Amino acid sequence: SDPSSINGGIVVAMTGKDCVAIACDLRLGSQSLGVSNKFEKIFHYGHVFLGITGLATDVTTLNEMFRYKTNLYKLKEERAIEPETFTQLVSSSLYERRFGPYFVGPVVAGINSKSGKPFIAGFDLIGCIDEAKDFIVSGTASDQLFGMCESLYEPNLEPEDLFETISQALLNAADRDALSGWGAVVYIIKKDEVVKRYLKMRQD
Amino acid sequence: TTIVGVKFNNGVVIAADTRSTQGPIVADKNCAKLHRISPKIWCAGAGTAADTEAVTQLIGSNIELHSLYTSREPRVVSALQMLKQHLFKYQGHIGAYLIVAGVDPTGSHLFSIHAHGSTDVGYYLSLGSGSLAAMAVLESHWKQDLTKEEAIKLASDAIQAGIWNDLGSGSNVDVCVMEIGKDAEYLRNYLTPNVREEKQKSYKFPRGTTAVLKESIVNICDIQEE
Amino acid sequence: TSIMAVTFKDGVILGADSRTTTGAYIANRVTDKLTRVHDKIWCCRSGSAADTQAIADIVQYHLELYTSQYGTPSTETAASVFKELCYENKDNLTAGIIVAGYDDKNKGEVYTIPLGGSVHKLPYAIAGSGSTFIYGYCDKNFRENMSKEETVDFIKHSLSQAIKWDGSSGGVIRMVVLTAAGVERLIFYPDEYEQL
Amino acid sequence: TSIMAVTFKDGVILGADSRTTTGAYIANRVTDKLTRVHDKIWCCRSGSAADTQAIADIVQYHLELYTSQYGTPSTETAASVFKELCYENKDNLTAGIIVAGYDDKNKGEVYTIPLGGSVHKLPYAIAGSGSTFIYGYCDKNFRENMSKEETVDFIKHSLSQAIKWDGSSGGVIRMVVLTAAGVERLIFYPDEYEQL
Amino acid sequence: TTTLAFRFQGGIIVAVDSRATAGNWVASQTVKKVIEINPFLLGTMAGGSADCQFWETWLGSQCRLHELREKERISVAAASKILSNLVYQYKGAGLSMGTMICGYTRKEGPTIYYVDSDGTRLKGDIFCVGSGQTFAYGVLDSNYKWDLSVEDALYLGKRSILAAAHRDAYSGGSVNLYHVTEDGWIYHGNHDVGELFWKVKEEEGSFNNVIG
Amino acid sequence: TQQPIVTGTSVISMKYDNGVIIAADNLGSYGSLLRFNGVERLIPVGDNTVVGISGDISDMQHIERLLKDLVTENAYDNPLADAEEALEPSYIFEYLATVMYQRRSKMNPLWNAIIVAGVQSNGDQFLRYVNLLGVTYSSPTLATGFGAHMANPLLRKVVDRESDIPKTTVQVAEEAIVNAMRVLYYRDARSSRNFSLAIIDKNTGLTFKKNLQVENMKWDFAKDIKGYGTQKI
Amino acid sequence: MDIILGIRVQDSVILASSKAVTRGISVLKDSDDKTRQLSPHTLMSFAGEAGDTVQFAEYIQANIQLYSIREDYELSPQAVSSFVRQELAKSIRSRRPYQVNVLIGGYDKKKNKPELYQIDYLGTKVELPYGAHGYSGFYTFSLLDHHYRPDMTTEEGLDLLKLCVQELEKRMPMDFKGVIVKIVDKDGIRQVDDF
Amino acid sequence: MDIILGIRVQDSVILASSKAVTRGISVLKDSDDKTRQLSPHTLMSFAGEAGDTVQFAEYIQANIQLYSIREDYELSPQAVSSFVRQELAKSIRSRRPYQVNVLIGGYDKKKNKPELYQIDYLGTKVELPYGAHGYSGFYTFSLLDHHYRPDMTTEEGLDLLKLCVQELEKRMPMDFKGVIVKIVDKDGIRQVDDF
Amino acid sequence: QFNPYGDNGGTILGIAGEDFAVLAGDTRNITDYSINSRYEPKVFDCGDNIVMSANGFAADGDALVKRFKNSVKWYHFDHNDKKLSINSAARNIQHLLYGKRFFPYYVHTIIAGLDEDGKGAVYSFDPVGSYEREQCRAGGAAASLIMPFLDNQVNFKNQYEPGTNGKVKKPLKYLSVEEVIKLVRDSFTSATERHIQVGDGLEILIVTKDGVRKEFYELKRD
Ligand SMILES: *[B]([O])([O])[C]([C][C]([C])[C])[N]C(=O)[C]([C]C1=[C][C]=[C][C]=[C]1)[N]C(=O)C1=[C]N=[C][C]=N1
Ligand SMILES: *[B]([O])([O])[C]([C][C]([C])[C])[N]C(=O)[C]([C]C1=[C][C]=[C][C]=[C]1)[N]C(=O)C1=[C]N=[C][C]=N1
Ligand SMILES: *[B]([O])([O])[C]([C][C]([C])[C])[N]C(=O)[C]([C]C1=[C][C]=[C][C]=[C]1)[N]C(=O)C1=[C]N=[C][C]=N1
Ligand SMILES: *[B]([O])([O])[C]([C][C]([C])[C])[N]C(=O)[C]([C]C1=[C][C]=[C][C]=[C]1)[N]C(=O)C1=[C]N=[C][C]=N1
Ligand SMILES: [Cl-]
Ligand SMILES: [Cl-]
Ligand SMILES: [Mg+2]
Ligand SMILES: [Mg+2]
Ligand SMILES: [Mg+2]
Numbered sequence A: 001s002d003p004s005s006i007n008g009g010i011v012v013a014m015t016g017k018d019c020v021a022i023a024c025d026l027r028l029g030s031q032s033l034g035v036s037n038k039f040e041k042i043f044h045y046g047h048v049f050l051g052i053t054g055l056a057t058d059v060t061t062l063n064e065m066f067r068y069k070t071n072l073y074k075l076k077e078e079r080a081i082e083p084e085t086f087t088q089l090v091s092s093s094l095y096e097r098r099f100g101p102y103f104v105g106p107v108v109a110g111i112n113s114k115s116g117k118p119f120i121a122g123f124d125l126i127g128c129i130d131e132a133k134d135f136i137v138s139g140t141a142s143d144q145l146f147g148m149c150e151s152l153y154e155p156n157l158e159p160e161d162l163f164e165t166i167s168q169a170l171l172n173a174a175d176r177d178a179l180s181g182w183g184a185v186v187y188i189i190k191k192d193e194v195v196k197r198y199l200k201m202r203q204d
Numbered sequence B: 001t002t003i004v005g006v007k008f009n010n011g012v013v014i015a016a017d018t019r020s021t022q023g024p025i026v027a028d029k030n031c032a033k034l035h036r037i038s039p040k041i042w043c044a045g046a047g048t049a050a051d052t053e054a055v056t057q058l059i060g061s062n063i064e065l066h067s068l069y070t071s072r073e074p075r076v077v078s079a080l081q082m083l084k085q086h087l088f089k090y091q092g093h094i095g096a097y098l099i100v101a102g103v104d105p106t107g108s109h110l111f112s113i114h115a116h117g118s119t120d121v122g123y124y125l126s127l128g129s130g131s132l133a134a135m136a137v138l139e140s141h142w143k144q145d146l147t148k149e150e151a152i153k154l155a156s157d158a159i160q161a162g163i164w165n166d167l168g169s170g171s172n173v174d175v176c177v178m179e180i181g182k183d184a185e186y187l188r189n190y191l192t193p194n195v196r197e198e199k200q201k202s203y204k205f206p207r208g209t210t211a212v213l214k215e216s217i218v219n220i221c222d223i224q225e226e
Numbered sequence C, D: 001t002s003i004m005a006v007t008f009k010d011g012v013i014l015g016a017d018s019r020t021t022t023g024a025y026i027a028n029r030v031t032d033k034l035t036r037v038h039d040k041i042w043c044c045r046s047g048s049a050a051d052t053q054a055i056a057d058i059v060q061y062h063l064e065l066y067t068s069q070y071g072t073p074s075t076e077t078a079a080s081v082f083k084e085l086c087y088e089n090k091d092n093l094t095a096g097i098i099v100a101g102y103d104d105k106n107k108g109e110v111y112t113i114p115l116g117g118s119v120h121k122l123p124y125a126i127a128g129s130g131s132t133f134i135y136g137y138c139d140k141n142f143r144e145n146m147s148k149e150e151t152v153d154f155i156k157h158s159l160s161q162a163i164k165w166d167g168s169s170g171g172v173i174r175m176v177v178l179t180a181a182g183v184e185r186l187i188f189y190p191d192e193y194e195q196l
Numbered sequence E: 001t002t003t004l005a006f007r008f009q010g011g012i013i014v015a016v017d018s019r020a021t022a023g024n025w026v027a028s029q030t031v032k033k034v035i036e037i038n039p040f041l042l043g044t045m046a047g048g049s050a051d052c053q054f055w056e057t058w059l060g061s062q063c064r065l066h067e068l069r070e071k072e073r074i075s076v077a078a079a080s081k082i083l084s085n086l087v088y089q090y091k092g093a094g095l096s097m098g099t100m101i102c103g104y105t106r107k108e109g110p111t112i113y114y115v116d117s118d119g120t121r122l123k124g125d126i127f128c129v130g131s132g133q134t135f136a137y138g139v140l141d142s143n144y145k146w147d148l149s150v151e152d153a154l155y156l157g158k159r160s161i162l163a164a165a166h167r168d169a170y171s172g173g174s175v176n177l178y179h180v181t182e183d184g185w186i187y188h189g190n191h192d193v194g195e196l197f198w199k200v201k202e203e204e205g206s207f208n209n210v211i212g
Numbered sequence F: 001t002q003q004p005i006v007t008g009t010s011v012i013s014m015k016y017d018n019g020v021i022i023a024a025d026n027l028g029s030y031g032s033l034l035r036f037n038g039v040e041r042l043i044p045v046g047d048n049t050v051v052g053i054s055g056d057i058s059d060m061q062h063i064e065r066l067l068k069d070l071v072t073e074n075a076y077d078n079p080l081a082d083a084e085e086a087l088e089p090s091y092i093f094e095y096l097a098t099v100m101y102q103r104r105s106k107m108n109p110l111w112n113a114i115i116v117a118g119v120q121s122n123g124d125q126f127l128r129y130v131n132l133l134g135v136t137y138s139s140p141t142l143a144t145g146f147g148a149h150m151a152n153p154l155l156r157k158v159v160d161r162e163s164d165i166p167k168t169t170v171q172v173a174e175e176a177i178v179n180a181m182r183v184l185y186y187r188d189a190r191s192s193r194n195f196s197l198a199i200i201d202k203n204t205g206l207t208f209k210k211n212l213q214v215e216n217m218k219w220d221f222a223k224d225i226k227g228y229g230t231q232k233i
Numbered sequence G, H: 001m002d003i004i005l006g007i008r009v010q011d012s013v014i015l016a017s018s019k020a021v022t023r024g025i026s027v028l029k030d031s032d033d034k035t036r037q038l039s040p041h042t043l044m045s046f047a048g049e050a051g052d053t054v055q056f057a058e059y060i061q062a063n064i065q066l067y068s069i070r071e072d073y074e075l076s077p078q079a080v081s082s083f084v085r086q087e088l089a090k091s092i093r094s095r096r097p098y099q100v101n102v103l104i105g106g107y108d109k110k111k112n113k114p115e116l117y118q119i120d121y122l123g124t125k126v127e128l129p130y131g132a133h134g135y136s137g138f139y140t141f142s143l144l145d146h147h148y149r150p151d152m153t154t155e156e157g158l159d160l161l162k163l164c165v166q167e168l169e170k171r172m173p174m175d176f177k178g179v180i181v182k183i184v185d186k187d188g189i190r191q192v193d194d195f
Numbered sequence I: 001q002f003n004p005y006g007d008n009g010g011t012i013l014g015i016a017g018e019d020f021a022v023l024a025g026d027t028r029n030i031t032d033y034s035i036n037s038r039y040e041p042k043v044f045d046c047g048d049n050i051v052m053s054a055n056g057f058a059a060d061g062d063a064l065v066k067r068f069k070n071s072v073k074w075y076h077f078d079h080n081d082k083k084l085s086i087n088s089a090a091r092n093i094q095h096l097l098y099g100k101r102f103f104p105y106y107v108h109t110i111i112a113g114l115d116e117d118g119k120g121a122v123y124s125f126d127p128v129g130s131y132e133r134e135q136c137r138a139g140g141a142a143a144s145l146i147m148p149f150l151d152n153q154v155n156f157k158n159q160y161e162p163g164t165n166g167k168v169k170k171p172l173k174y175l176s177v178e179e180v181i182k183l184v185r186d187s188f189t190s191a192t193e194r195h196i197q198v199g200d201g202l203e204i205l206i207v208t209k210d211g212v213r214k215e216f217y218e219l220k221r222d
């Protein structure tokens, strides 16, 4: 009944030293029934990464929508959209559906190509921006993720250390949620290289 | 949320806490609730966070165009009128509860706004879940002919009352001072009485602690030449 | 809310408390419920603060535009504009308004517009939650062609009782006097009217 | 219903209208709401007619049995018996009762028992739907140690206004005087009290 | 919850999962969903944890009192009926139970009774109970035979719970195995699904859908 | 299950160095009607305890009779009724707390919020809360209803934690309480100007103050406030 | 309607769909084909609310056939599935949404690969090796998890499908009157007439 | 449970009762006997809410068996049916009524006549030549109205019963997993093991 | 309509060591968005080296603890001053809770102590009496924030040994009382940051063979 917890899933993002990390589970379900273990929730438009939790049809719809908008942006602007600008675009787009919203929990992550500054941001389903320095969480195990992130996180982690922290934050949060898990992906993002890692986790 | 507004000798000051909450969870610990409508008209917002943001941007945008059209600096009553009429039209469904303050060629002004579109005038005001804690402080310590230094003190004390006693409020105190014949000074994190203590332990993991299945480079670059 | 308007020899006087409540919390203890739609046509507001403000703002706009074309409007005209808004939008409004004004030709007039949107011209009118408690007092004590000082005392004593018994009413007693001489504002504080 | 009891120099006087309604139909226009639970302890009834009769009948029984064992009960005792019934059966009762009585030791006393079943000893009391309209009037006009004639005029004028404004109240104004001299019944008809 | 029990040549196999949830929140992964009523009787637990726990340890007290009074082991029929008659008294009040009472006696042989908080009492060869019962049924019905070895039967039960643990969101944690023969039940260990899945996938060649 | 009919608003209280202070206004409201203006809601028990009650007045009066009966019962066959075996604040509270929870458990609550303020035999300050649900808690400052939202913030600025209690005098504490009552009169639509205040000191005993009024009120600034925005006259 | 299954093997996609049509108390028909050919190498099975199912299926069919004529070209299964998802995603926020769940089985002639897409009435699309809608998956996914290997032949796929249908016929309360099975491969679409 | 049928022929009463036990989504059992022998020449089939059915049937059985021992005599089918009706008529105004419908088939050894009684959970008794509970009658009564003749034979009765079950298996949505058939005559009660 | 239940917030945490056990809980008591008390003890010494906390609706919590304390008293009277073992206490609490199955104590109960072999023991209950011995358990408002952290940092879940890449798990080495208290403090500091009903103070009761010791720590008061 509650649209935001029919399909299930989670996304988490973190900042490190000259790097950002964004991670998500791979589950898609119909309430109790597990349907797919290859439903990735992180997308990217140029060097800007977007994770989306919530109702899966809206996750797909919004990805297609932001691909649409960022492609037109690039043709007109003659440059790739930056994380700060994209964050404003997500907020605008969501709020225009104020009274008929997309049931989603988006998470932006990326590094500004000009300043080199790491950036993350979260949103509610209608556009409010949460621009945290440390971390952003989203999905059915957001409470769990808040608990993991708030204890495990420390500032200025190196890319390979940040990987371990975000991976353990996701995995242990997902294992305390019935509607999350069934695999996981972690993106480690640096100014001009991005590494994508699939995690081995319990398949129940 | 705790937000306040206090008039003084030569202007007006507004303040706010920095906690945003989804139910009993804190979404953001250092949230920015002081919004700029124009250079010398600022308002603080309580209620639905997207709404206070959106309604401020829209009116702020139209105020800017109006200022350019008329070749005059914007007035607080214009922002007030535009905000109330917008909110009334939406019959309370846009959940924005605002304290609007500022200085303009007419003088210094302080107003409140509720979601259904009703406005109120006052020398001291408070809104949000911690408004009762804040108003208790304001009713105990407010007087006529406050100085700038006294008004900032009173405003931040009123926010603190909200921070400590209201569970819907917390973290830091943001202030904005708008004095006549001066630039508005926005004091982000004016007080920081809630820094977290050092943790007992470091939870940095040994590298190779997490099990990995696959690795791959992601192509973020465009299609290449040659 | 405790509001009233009373005609007398030299014109009309509007009176009101200053309390605005959200349940049992007093959101504003120094509210001004006496509002100006024209130079010598004012109104008392009760019910929703948003609705009565929105209405009063629109009326002021209509009467400003009326004045620019046809000169000063009558109090009856002002009441009619209020009625048109309150009647035609009765499903969506919660507004109980008393309209009071001073012409030179018609002198002091009072029109009350309750929830339905009906209009009633009266020598004096009372409204708001606190008015219930002073129907007896006001009926017994009202006379026509009172003096300014007598009418001020009548409103002061009346609203004092309304405040005393109604939790939704309180604070200061504001008044606005409308005569040929001009527009005078009066204020009366708790220490004064409570000992009456 | 408009009911009241007022203490004065020589004792206490109870007053009431005579209207009983089933919605907007007046089921009885000559009702006697002033009822006797003891020689010089009476009560005014408001709310459910069935409930207040059942209660008053039980109280009269208790005070009759009290008298047979311990002699004449005090007015306070009578009020306590009313309270015990109204409080302990608050979930199932709709009764607003004013108890008034005359002792030689305590003279005239008035106790009001609202819906909850709480007791409040007062110099005078008002109750019933019509009482709302005369809080202002009664507060302004009540004095302690009035004469019999003054108290009759106070009740007559008060209930007149309550009747004038309340649809649930009307008919004749009944009164019962309780003094050392004895028990006197008074009645006042519409033609008399409407012109006040 | 996924719990199963089935009769075969070597007696009875009982297999259960370990997960307990409050909404989407995983409350526990280490729940004992099998109770040792005595050395010969087992009860499975599904539905309300408290209801199942309380009334099945109560059942063990009634079974002990029977064999004290009658100088003889209680039958599976009699034991299951004590529980079903009890819950029937509480019918409508809101008890939430789905249980298998499993045992072996001389007069009956291996016996399984499905007992239910609506008052249903059914004797049978195969039962699966819980939110993930349908998933377990698939594996069982296609691989079940009377002539299974204790070793093969134990694996089938383990595998059927694993199948449900994977698909059913309200099942998982670990697998507890029991084997019931004439001489009493015999515990066959706790098996973590997080390790069992990757083991079975590799060795069996199953779950080719999942990447490992 | 019922609904409250005639009701009393906030009861406020705090500890200080040598004892406790408690206060409550003298109003009995009937919905929005300010019906009864002479209702005492502080009820002393002996010379060492004061019970402050908010909520339903009929239930308050019932509780008042229970406490009166409690004193009578304690005196029975008790030569030390006015000495070592006198009623303590802790005894009186625990009794009420037992009753409140029992009544909620029969789904027929006494619709009240109660604060028991007093001083124990050994001079220790006692201050504890109980309500219609049987919920209990203690704190250097306690308040019911609106007092919880408006009084506590002001009273916690004087005594923020346990260690602030010995540093707080009776003059400073009373001042804080009286100010809180004024604030509640500004802002609570079901309050009255008239109130009662009680001080229980370990040295000077029980001081019960009746017919107090809220004074030194600020209203003058109202004259400058005109309209709701754009209006100038 | 009730049970619709899908499974993709080495070189084909197999769709099984029940034959029963029940309107309340009676089984009105026991030979109903719950599928439409969208293009020569793309088949869509469907199940949901009465009327809406066929109306939607035929509406999609018409649109794909129109595309085929206009461009003289067959759309990829991926392209068709994306079109269908968009129609359902549009539908869910309409005055009266299409209450229809579908499986799209197609053979991509460009990549020489079979493809199976599962899309629910909300517009929730997933590519799978095997899929189902409604209560079918609750029984069949455990068998397919266990028995499925991605390199099966079409004959092995049909045997695994028989094992699914047998389990459904054992444990489901509703009599769905057997299934119509259809195979989608490089040579197009054909129906298995004996199942 | 679901389908229970009854038919009285010349010299016997035949009761047919479904074997399925379905709880929500799964069919837990396909060999359930929804009947109890009350006495050597009296059989009662039953269907209704879970738990209540067996509880009621066994409670009646116990009472009739008690009567049989006390009096060393078998009650007539009419007498047993009246006892059962009274228990259900008492039940319907209880705190929690028995939600059980029954058919009582018996052979009266005194009158040498078969007898079939239909009683619903309200305590509504009727003697019939053929009867049913639930949705069974909606299909089967038309066939029985046509084909039923009162001098039929136990085998003709079984053939007519097969025609009823075939119609149910064709038109009913629920799979009731066939029926257990039992015959009540002068020689007592026996079960037809092949149907 | 009258609602007999309420929510007093708070959070509790029990951890069983090798020869000790801790039961911690914050000291904040609340209703809705108001603070009732910054220091209202929630974890209690019940005698016989058993500590208990019933978190949730405080009135039911106080009632349950009061009745269990009473049960310990009467266990001594009725069985010759025999020490009530932790397992026996747990079963006794199940019956106290299930006794009100159809009008439950709206609380999450946790007890801690030592078993009869001297090893650390924690038991956890739901509102209607289902219970289970556990190594680790958080209860109450911020339980969802704390438990995942404890799965990771107490049971070393999802942690493996460097160089082996997922093949070899991190070995389950035992934790000292000083190590456990560090994890408890960090759990509550983290919970305080992200949960509005957690704060003010942290009170920890430590149980060893020597007896019951207490430790108090300040938490953020916003
Ligand atoms: B304050 O407490 O009123 C605060 C001020 C706001 C401008 C940041 N309000 C909120 O934080 C609201 C509370 C709320 C919760 C639920 C519905 C409506 C309002 N929070 C949010 O709007 C919110 C919640 N989660 C994410 C983003 N925004
Ligand atoms: B008066 O009490 O009717 C008053 C007059 C108004 C014009 C200021 N109205 C209110 O105070 C209303 C509530 C109300 C009380 C009694 C009857 C009807 C309505 N208040 C508001 O509309 C309100 C409250 N809080 C914030 C904004 N507006
Ligand atoms: B009075 O108006 O309260 C009156 C006093 C009663 C003692 C005679 N009560 C009634 O007239 C009531 C209705 C009512 C009116 C107003 C408030 C509460 C109740 N009438 C009856 O109880 C009644 C009506 N018709 C027949 C019998 N009883
Ligand atoms: B199983 O999922 O049915 C399981 C078995 C039980 C014996 C532990 N039940 C639960 O997990 C129930 C919830 C439930 C989920 C799905 C179907 C039916 C019931 N949970 C609890 O009983 C529970 C939850 N939190 C604490 C304690 N017990
Ligand atoms: Cl206003
Ligand atoms: Cl009468
Ligand atoms: Mg699972
Ligand atoms: Mg009348
Ligand atoms: Mg019938």
Ligand SMILES: [Mg+2]
Binding pocket: B162, B163, B164, B165, B166, B167, B168, B169, B170, I221, I222
């Ligand atoms: Mg706070």
